[PDB]
Ligand binder design. Structure first.
Ligand code: CLA
Ligand code: CLA
Ligand code: CLA
Ligand code: CLA
Ligand code: CLA
Ligand code: CLA
Ligand code: CLA
Ligand code: CLA
Ligand SMILES: CC1=C(/C=C/C(C)=C/C=C/C(C)=C/C=C/C=C(C)/C=C/C=C(C)/C=C/C2=C(C)CCCC2(C)C)C(C)(C)CCC1
Ligand SMILES: CC1=C(C/C=C(\C)CCC[C@H](C)CCC[C@H](C)CCCC(C)C)C(=O)c2ccccc2C1=O
Ligand SMILES: CC1=C(C/C=C(\C)CCC[C@H](C)CCC[C@H](C)CCCC(C)C)C(=O)c2ccccc2C1=O
Ligand code: SF4
Lengths: 172, 645, 165, 253, 123
């Protein structure tokens, strides 16, 4: 719909969001190994086939029982998306990070959010409800998927091998 | 045992080293009535309510005691035009100037409406009020310590509670008051207005008095019963009888089988009930404030102008405070509930509702204050014909000037209440609407963005009252529902201050206009409000600066107390500015230096001095701001309306 | 004789009370019967609004015309309309013409429901048995019954006036 | 059922009341109800009273029990369980289709229609929600047929139409409600002011096209913001035209 | 020498007394040469209270409100095609910026109020 959402594609409305962020904010860049801490840290790779962009999913079976809300991300106004892929043991209710309530599926579940903070809040809520394997992904403008949160497979609360200290200052 | 547990909070405070700080004391005060969720929460709430009822009974007993002993109530009965004073002031220091304090609470008019003619009756009422307070304290004790859990009253026994309140409390109280009116408040006022002496009130319940002296049931009695001070009591008695009948009939003719609190926890249910109750009480207070001067109901009430002004302003302030507290407790109930799925439609239309209200507030503010600033600019530029006034571009409130309808045996209130409105009324009413909308915007935003928001996505994990989430995301200060209530209290203060300013200026303008003389019948505009309340300069000159002469020239007069409270209110209001503008960290470092000074002299307090927390500092600043502003308006209004009326 | 199934139990003394006592339904295609329902609903909505306008004009709530005439307008809605300047009457005609144009050229109504000029059938689901609060057919019948009643009520008002005063 | 909910005397609780309490309480909640639940107090009174247990109780304790326990009708009536089941089915459905209330006199009044609030394309999109004001066919074909969106219109046509509308509107609030209201040249001054406002907003639109370059109207190839800039230029032209037409209709007639 | 001992003197005889002519800069009767200074008096009070706004209310509230306003803009017709909030994103003033701007309004109203009062009193 044209009054509900702008008629132009998100890329058309974005204009030159890239090549201007590199100019407006030349400091805003990710390090060579963003989700991880060391170059030799496996760096599991996922593609759009595994976690597709939300505009390519309509009535997906992995979506939870969500009725839609005005508090979701800005389609056609933002292109970055964060996705959560967690597997349930039973169908129960949970709070969406954007307010409102959704009901989890019996098996696989998949949600899309704009900010990573919403995904991390949902992960905290789910882990408080005894849920493992909560994987958080990031969707870029061109569809490249970056795997986040349990980046090396082990949650950051638990120390794991192969994790080089970062921003560690050897004094008080 | 119980005495040991009375200071149990202090014992717990000193038990752990983490609670050996002044911040622990301030938390102990802030979390005093915040009854935590437990098996005895409902007992605690009900007992606290009964204790408050006992406190109010103590207050009523004290007021009747002052009326009995420290008031010129009998002299006021002999001459209602005299100043009602009910607070003697002893000769200590040098305060003897204000020894008779003109009380403006309307207790004299109330007691006259109750048929009270002797100070012995006031003594009896004070004694029975003390007895009732003692009974309420006994009942509150009992319920807190030995009674039912009361946990079923809001979910299970809500039908019984609502039906009892509908029939017994409300209807039977209205019926009993109608009986009291008809039997002792009408006859006593008849015998006082006629000046034929008043017998004992019980002698009116004899079936041989005027009840059977004449059986005529209309406006005809001994000699000539033409007292118009008496008719409002007749109308009140008829209203109470009709209200009792309709309440009793409709209570049994109502479903009442719909409790929306099934999905809420007991604590959240209590908070939501408190919020809706506060909304109802606040709107009732505002309605009574309007109706007090809209309709005469107490004997010799309209004549006593300070009483009318005080009743209006006090009830407007109480209504505004309770309306804000309504949204405060709605936010508390929403954020403290585990599964508050009931507000799903509004939490999913969060941004839609908030943004439409934002546009409404922006539109109203720009339009109303732009009318005011445009009038200011045009009058400054010497362009009175370009202003917004009756002699210029006229913003006549047409929707106000129509209430005509088919009669069907009606009268009086079938019109605009016999008052014509002008451009000034239109503009000030739109200012009122805008300020109310902004207060509602802040409160509704606090309610909606209570569990989550686009900025912080786990605000429900932060509970109701938190200072911030941090300086991140650009800064997240004042996101809590508590902080939204904190800002909404300022905007309620602004709204109610403008409302009472409008009422006070209109009241003084009407008093001056009716003081035409008798021959002067072209009031033109005159109507100082209608002619000058169109500019901000008009207000600042002809209302604030003009009426401040009474309160600032009160030294050496009985209103010197009002002058001193005016000054103290300004002082407290600037101290509020101190608390609101500053921050916790600086004061913490200052206290660190002061505490070093203490340690240098072996003083070393162990309750470690900590400055007020961020939320505590905001609350102290808001309390001082409200106190200072409301006290300034209180002193100003009372001095102006007592000296000049 | 039963309903033509394109109307399908949508009126009468009861909802399934196909009432036509004139043969205005037989041998008529579904488009024509949909047109009949659209005309009935438009006439209704216009009436239902006109009755409220009449009773709010005959009750003294006649601003915007109190100001235009610069004097209190007549309570009688026919005389009140006659008091209006031809500029105002033709402005009303032009606005209704613009509204009718809107619902034909740029915003044509749904083919299967020409009465749905707002296109409400694109956001509402239906009345279903899983819905405990399903009342869409009930509110459709409320609209139709109040439409049919106000269609004769407004004529009663108009012909009662201008012939009795 | 559970052993303690068997042969409970009517004095403690009615049979219908017990059935209603069980109906409104989750099945897993039994055998260990929470302290604040009705079922917990009903259980506590179920023991120590009935069959071989204590058959009598003091009057004060009887009053306590009566206050703390339901009384079947109007509290645990079958209609109340029906309403609770309806409410839970409603909340299940709103995760999906939402019933439509409208706030009338400040209180939400149910209409009878149920919306499709769930977005058509992206479930978690915050701006793809469906409302009759923004998703009904009238809205789609009204905003879609406006000059800014109407199919078959060149950029200059959109600009000209929007400008004509804006210019004809803007002459209004200036001829009357202005400094030179009661003057013979009120219409001319209003026309000049409307043309000035059209020019200022057109300069603003040119500024937007030069800075943001919206690119939503550009044809193939071309340059970023060419379509929007053409729209704004023809909006200026149409604004002048519509303002002149309004001034003409004011001077005449 | 007598009324400066007590602060009600500082109000009545200084501020309330010396504002009599300034407020009459413009009224229903007309406007004189002090009209500009009464207008500046009001303007300075307005600036001072806007500083009150920036000092009392802090960021988070305003950031959420601005987020909702951005939602209204992005959902508004005829403008989502043109403004995607990517260019000069509207965010609430930072805490330091807000404190400075509130202080600036406070002192601007301070200076202009006292200048207008001095002119209206010593004219
Ligand atoms: C509603 C609460 C309330 C309030 C605000 C007041 C306020 C006041 N009362 Mg009071 N009073 C109240 C309830 C209240 N009373 C009740 C319920 C009773 C009945 C027991 C009395 C009986 C009473 C007497 C008998 C007297 C006052 C007096 C006073 C005044 C001075 C008090 C004093 O000397 O402090 C003394 C405080 C203490 C010694 C601390 C204990 C002051 C205006 C006095 C007054 O007006 O003097 C002219 C006075 O003589 N009151
Ligand atoms: C720091 C400021 C300050 C100072 C120095 C004073 C000083 C004084 N005030 Mg004062 N006052 C102040 C602030 C101050 N006040 C404030 C803020 C207010 C507003 C509430 C007032 C309101 C006020 C009133 C209304 C009155 C005074 C009076 C007095 C005088 C009598 C004091 C007296 O006999 O106490 C009595 C107590 C003692 C003498 C203490 C006992 C002696 C000690 C324990 C001896 C210890 C052993 C060596 C005294 C000169 C009175 C007056 O007129 O006097 C001229 C009076 O009637 N004051
Ligand atoms: C005819 C009998 C009767 C009467 C006169 C009252 C009267 C009152 N009740 Mg009440 N109540 C009743 C029966 C009655 N109740 C029954 C049967 C129940 C059990 C369901 C309750 C449970 C109840 C609670 C839980 C509370 C009251 C409260 C109140 C007081 C304030 C009511 C209010 O503002 O709304 C509220 C008022 C004195 C309130 C109060 O102030 O407590 C003292 C309060 O919190 N009542
Ligand atoms: C029926 C009325 C009512 C009731 C029963 C409650 C009950 C409650 N409120 Mg509440 N509230 C109300 C009205 C009410 N409120 C209104 C009208 C407002 C808007 C102003 C609020 C705003 C509000 C906020 C913002 C908060 C509460 C909170 C609370 C809870 C804890 C209260 C506490 O510990 O305070 C203890 C008692 C005090 C702090 C009293 C101290 C004195 C106050 C601050 C100033 C009084 C100054 C005085 C009038 C002037 C002095 C005289 C002068 C001459 C010197 C409790 C459930 C808190 C909570 O967490 O809830 C869960 C909370 O954060 N309320
Ligand atoms: C916001 C409140 C407000 C309002 C309503 C007015 C109104 C007015 N001012 Mg004014 N003014 C204000 C604030 C306001 N002022 C302030 C704060 C100042 C101080 C800077 C001034 C300073 C000022 C001066 C110095 C002068 C005026 C003048 C005027 C008059 C002519 C203005 C003009 O040309 O209109 C321009 C109007 C428009 C361009 C139209 C805007 C409004 C349209 C109709 C909105 C439509 C929205 C639409 C319905 C949306 C839905 C569309 C959808 C259905 C498709 C007019 C009576 C002049 C005068 O003397 O006249 C008496 C004049 O010389 N003003
Ligand atoms: C078929 C529907 C219909 C028609 C043809 C009219 C026609 C008329 N009405 Mg009217 N009216 C209607 C419905 C209708 N009304 C309804 C439903 C209401 C209730 C809100 C009103 C309320 C109303 C008022 C309060 C006034 C009129 C007036 C008028 C007359 C001048 C036009 C005008 O200013 O309208 C203005 C109409 C509105 C502001 C209401 C628009 C609501 C529409 C119907 C919703 C679509 C004109 C004869 C005015 C007059 O002077 O009469 C001589 C006048 O004062 N009407
Ligand atoms: C603030 C004053 C102002 C500004 C900034 C502009 C700005 C502009 N005008 Mg303009 N204009 C104005 C007042 C203004 N106009 C007035 C008062 C008139 C009436 C005489 C005109 C008559 C006018 C014409 C006749 C034309 C412009 C055109 C233009 C554009 C070159 C530019 C957008 C030109 C245009 O359409 O550009 C596309 C053009 O042909 N203007
Ligand atoms: C169809 C085109 C048209 C026509 C027939 C007229 C007709 C007229 N214009 Mg005009 N005008 C038009 C378009 C038109 N205007 C446009 C598009 C503009 C904007 C540039 C103007 C700006 C304009 C001005 C500024 C003035 C006229 C004036 C006049 C009058 C000589 C006459 C009634 C003059 C006038 O007021 O006459 C009474 C005058 O001063 N016109
Ligand atoms: C009332 C109403 C409405 C509506 C509103 C509106 C929106 C209005 C508007 C209106 C308008 C707004 C209109 C307009 C018109 C315009 C015109 C009419 C124009 C014209 C122009 C022209 C014609 C021009 C021409 C030219 C050119 C083109 C250029 C050159 C020059 C010339 C001049 C040639 C609604 C539905 C909402 C609802 C309620 C009712
Ligand atoms: C001053 C100040 C403090 C310091 C306040 C403290 C340490 C409170 C302690 C003050 C004492 C308790 C004052 C005691 C009362 C006074 C002596 C006045 C009352 C009695 C007189 C009238 C006689 C804060 O902690 C703070 C925190 C956040 C924002 C702003 C501020 C702030 O402005
Ligand atoms: C009102 C308010 C805002 C909102 C105010 C904002 C966002 C600034 C207002 C901008 C004014 C209205 C000008 C808007 C832009 C103009 C068109 C000028 C543009 C100038 C640039 C081109 C340089 C805050 O961001 C804030 C932050 C922290 C504490 C308190 C507050 C606060 O009180
Ligand atoms: S200034 Fe204070 S309230 Fe604001 S973010 Fe920083 S610590 Fe929190």
């Amino acid at each position: 719909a044209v009054p509900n959402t702008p008629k132009s594609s998100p890329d058309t409305l974005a204009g030159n969001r890239t090549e201007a962020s590199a100019v407006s904010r030349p400091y805003d860049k990710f390090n060579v190994n963003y989700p991880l801490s060391s170059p030799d840290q496996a760096r599991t790779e996922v593609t759009t086939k595994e976690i597709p962009r939300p505009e390519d999913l309509v009535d997906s079976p992995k979506f939870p029982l969500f009725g839609g809300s005005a508090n979701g991300y800005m389609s056609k106004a933002t292109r970055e998306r964060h996705a959560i892929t967690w597997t349930a043991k039973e169908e129960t209710t949970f709070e969406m990070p954007t307010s409102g309530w959704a009901m989890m599926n019996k098996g696989e579940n998949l949600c899309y959010f704009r900010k990573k903070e919403q995904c991390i809040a949902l992960c905290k809520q789910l882990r408080s409800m005894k849920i493992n394997d909560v994987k958080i992904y990031r969707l870029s403008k061109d569809g490249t998927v970056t795997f986040l949160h349990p980046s090396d497979g082990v949650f950051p609360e638990k120390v794991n091998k192969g994790r080089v200290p970062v921003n560690f200052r050897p004094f008080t | 045992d119980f005495s040991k547990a009375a200071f149990g909070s202090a014992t717990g405070l000193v038990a752990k080293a983490a609670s050996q700080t002044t911040t622990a004391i301030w938390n102990l005060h802030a979390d005093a009535h915040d009854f935590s969720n437990s098996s005895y929460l409902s007992k605690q709430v009900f007992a606290a309510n009964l204790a408050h009822i006992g406190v109010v009974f103590i207050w009523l007993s004290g007021m009747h005691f002052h009326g009995a002993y420290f008031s010129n109530y009998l002299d006021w009965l002999q001459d209602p035009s005299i100043a009602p004073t009910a607070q003697q002031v002893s000769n200590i220091a040098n305060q003897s100037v204000l020894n008779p304090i003109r009380v403006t609470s309307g207790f004299f008019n109330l007691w006259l409406a109750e048929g009270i003619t002797s100070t012995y009756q006031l003594k009896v009422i004070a004694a029975f009020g003390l007895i009732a307070s003692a009974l309420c304290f006994l009942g509150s004790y009992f319920h807190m310590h030995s009674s039912t859990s009361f946990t079923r009253v809001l979910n299970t026994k809500l039908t019984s509670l609502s039906t009892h309140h509908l029939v017994g409390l409300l209807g039977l109280g209205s019926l009993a008051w109608a009986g009291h009116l008809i039997h002792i408040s009408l006859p006593v006022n008849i015998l006082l207005n006629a000046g034929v002496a008043v017998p004992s009130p019980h002698s009116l319940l004899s079936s041989k008095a005027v009840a059977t002296i004449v059986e005529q049931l209309s406006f005809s009695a001994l000699t000539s019963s033409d007292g118009y001070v008496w008719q409002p009591l007749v109308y009140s008695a008829m209203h109470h009888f009709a209200l009792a009948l309709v309440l009793i009939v409709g209570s049994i003719f109502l479903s009442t089988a719909s409790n929306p609190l099934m999905s809420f926890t007991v604590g959240s249910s209590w908070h939501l009930v408190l919020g809706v109750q506060l909304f109802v009480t606040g709107t009732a207070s505002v309605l009574y404030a309007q109706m007090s001067n809209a309709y005469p109901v107490y004997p010799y009430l309209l004549t006593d102008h300070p009483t009318v002004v005080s009743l209006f302003v006090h009830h407007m302030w109480i209504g505004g405070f309770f309306l804000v507290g309504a949204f405060a407790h709605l936010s508390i109930g929403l954020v403290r509930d585990t599964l508050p799925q009931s507000f799903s439609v509004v939490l999913t239309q969060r941004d839609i509702i908030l943004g439409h209200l934002t546009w409404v507030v922006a539109f109203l503010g720009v339009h109303s204050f732009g009318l005011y600033v445009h009038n200011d600019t045009m009058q400054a530029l010497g362009r009175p014909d370009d202003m917004f006034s009756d002699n210029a571009i006229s913003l006549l409130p047409v929707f106000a000037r129509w209430s005509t309808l088919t009669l069907n045996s009606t009268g009086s209130a079938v019109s605009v209440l016999g008052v014509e409105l002008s451009t000034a009324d239109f503009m000030v009413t739109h200012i009122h609407a805008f300020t109310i909308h902004t207060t509602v915007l802040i409160l509704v935003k606090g309610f909606l963005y209570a569990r989550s928001s686009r900025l912080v996505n786990d605000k429900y994990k932060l509970d109701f009252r938190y200072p911030c989430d941090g300086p991140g995301r650009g800064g997240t200060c004042q996101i809590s529902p508590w902080d939204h209530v904190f800002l909404g209290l300022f905007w309620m203060y602004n709204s109610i201050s403008v409302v009472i300013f409008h009422f006070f200026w209109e009241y003084q303008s009407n008093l001056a206009s009716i003081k035409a003389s008798a021959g002067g019948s072209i009031r033109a505009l005159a109507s100082d409000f209608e002619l000058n309340s169109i500019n901000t300069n008009g207000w600042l000159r002809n209302f604030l600066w003009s009426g401040a002469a009474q309160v600032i020239q009160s030294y050496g007069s009985p209103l010197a107390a009002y002058g001193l409270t005016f000054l103290a209110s300004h002082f407290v209001w600037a101290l509020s500015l101190m608390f609101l503008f500053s921050g916790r960290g600086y004061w913490q470092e200052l206290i660190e230096s002061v505490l070093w000074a203490h340690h240098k002299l072996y003083v070393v307090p162990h309750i470690q001095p900590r400055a007020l927390s961020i939320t505590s500092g905001r609350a102290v600043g808001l309390t001082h701001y409200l106190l200072g502003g409301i006290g300034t308006t209180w002193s100003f209004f009372l001095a102006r309306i007592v000296a000049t009326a | 004789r039963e309903a033509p199934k394109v109307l399908a139990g949508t009126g009468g003394p009861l909802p399934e009370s196909f009432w036509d006592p004139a043969g205005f339904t037989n041998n008529k295609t579904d488009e024509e019967l949909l047109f009949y329902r659209a005309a009935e609903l438009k006439h209704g909505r216009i009436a239902m609004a006109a009755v409220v306008g009449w009773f709010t004009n005959a009750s003294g709530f006649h601003y915007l015309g109190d100001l235009w005439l610069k004097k209190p307008a007549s309570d009688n809605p026919i005389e009140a309309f006659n008091q209006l300047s031809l500029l105002g009457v033709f402005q009303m005609v032009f606005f209704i013409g613009c509204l009718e144009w809107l619902t034909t050229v740029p915003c044509p109504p749904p083919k299967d429901a020409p009465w749905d000029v707002i296109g409400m059938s694109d956001v509402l689901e239906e009345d279903t048995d899983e819905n405990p609060m399903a009342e869409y057919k009930k509110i459709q019948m409320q609209e139709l019954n109040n439409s049919r009643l106000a269609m004769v009520a407004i004529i009663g008002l108009i012909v009662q006036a201008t012939t009795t005063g | 059922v559970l052993p303690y909910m068997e042969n409970i005397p009517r004095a403690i609780v009615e049979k219908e009341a017990l059935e209603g309490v069980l109906a409104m309480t989750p099945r897993e909640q039994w055998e260990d109800p929470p302290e604040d639940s009705v079922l917990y107090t009903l259980k506590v009174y179920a023991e120590t009273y009935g069959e071989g247990k204590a058959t009598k109780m003091p009057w004060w304790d009887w009053l306590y029990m009566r206050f703390e326990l339901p009384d079947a009708n109007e509290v645990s009536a079958e209609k109340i369980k029906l309403m609770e089941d309806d409410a839970k089915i409603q909340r299940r459905m709103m995760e999906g289709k939402i019933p439509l209330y409208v706030p009338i006199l400040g209180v939400p009044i149910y209409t009878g229609m149920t919306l499709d609030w769930k977005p058509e394309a992206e479930l978690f999109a915050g701006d793809q929600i469906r409302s009759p004001i923004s998703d009904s066919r009238f809205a789609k074909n009204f905003i879609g047929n406006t000059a800014f969106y109407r199919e078959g219109l060149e950029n200059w046509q959109r600009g000209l139409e929007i400008g004509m509308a804006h210019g004809y509107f803007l002459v209004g609030p200036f001829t009357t409600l202005g400094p030179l209201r009661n003057t013979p040249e009120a219409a001319t001054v209003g026309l000049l002011s409307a043309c000035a406002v059209i020019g200022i907003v057109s300069v603003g639109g040119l500024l937007f096209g030069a800075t943001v370059k919206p690119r939503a109207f550009d044809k193939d190839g071309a340059t970023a913001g060419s379509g929007f800039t053409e729209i704004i230029n023809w909006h200026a032209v149409g604004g002048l035209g519509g303002a002149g037409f309004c001034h003409l209709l004011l001077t005449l007639f | 020498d007598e009324n400066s001992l007590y602060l009600m003197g500082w109000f009545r005889d200084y501020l309330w007394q010396n504002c009599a002519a300034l407020l009459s800069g413009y009224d229903s009767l007309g406007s004189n040469d002090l009209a500009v200074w009464a207008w500046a008096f009001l303007l300075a009070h307005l600036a001072w209270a806007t500083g009150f706004m920036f000092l009392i209310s802090w960021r988070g509230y305003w950031q959420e409100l601005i987020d909702t306003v951005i939602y209204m803009h992005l959902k508004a017709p005829f403008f989502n095609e043109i403004w995607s909030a990517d260019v000069v994103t509207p965010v609430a003033l930072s805490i330091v910026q807000a404190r400075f701007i509130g202080l600036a309004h406070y002192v601007a109203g301070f200076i202009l109020t006292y200048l207008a009062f001095v002119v209206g009193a010593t004219s």
